[PDB]
Amino acid sequence: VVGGTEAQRNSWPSQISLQYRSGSSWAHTCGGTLIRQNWVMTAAHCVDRELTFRVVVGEHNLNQNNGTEQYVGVQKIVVHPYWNTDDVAAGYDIALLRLAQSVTLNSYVQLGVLPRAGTILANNSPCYITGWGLTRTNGQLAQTLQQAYLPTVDYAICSSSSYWGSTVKNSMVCAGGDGVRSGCQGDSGGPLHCLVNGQYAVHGVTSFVSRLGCNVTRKPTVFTRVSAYISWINNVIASN
């Protein structure tokens, strides 16, 4: 997250760190949202590589013991069947991870609330992106979870020529684009949390930014629209 502020420890308890094994250690690669005690929602592109993944819940600082973390292996990865790694702009950037164990819920570990199917946010709706992604274009990961205020940019505006043009689809949510604040590498797969009827729900799964840079004016961060996938998500959980 570029232009973020450090999140409070208990603000976003559904945020997870998706990590891969790297030598004798683990490296953060993407975010995710805990949606069941044994299921995480993340981006398909985060799990294209043939790597060993684990999920950390209750995480705040990647580099220090918080006293709240639970670590769990990923047992099954279900990518959206229309996902194509060669074509992020086509959409379908979403995957579900079944965890090897069910995690324990507490102040630091909660299920993310998903929007009702088909819900579309009004232009300029208040949302926050969270994650440990780069804090600058071509920078380094955050140590502590960051948040940034990123208001939505509706489809009509987002798909206009000076924004994303044809690259953005109605199955996506755009947010931000102010040139200061944005998602960035390492935030992929994590949540966009938007306040609706007094309750935050996870309306986006972070998908992509401009090849030009993370915080680029009129290139808002682009997210998979969770509410386009409610049936898919329920179907996967039900059959697994």
């Binding site: 592109h45 985060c46 990961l141 090849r211």
Partner: peptide
Amino acid sequence: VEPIKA
């Protein structure tokens, strides 16, 4: 389009 990701 740059996935972000990591």
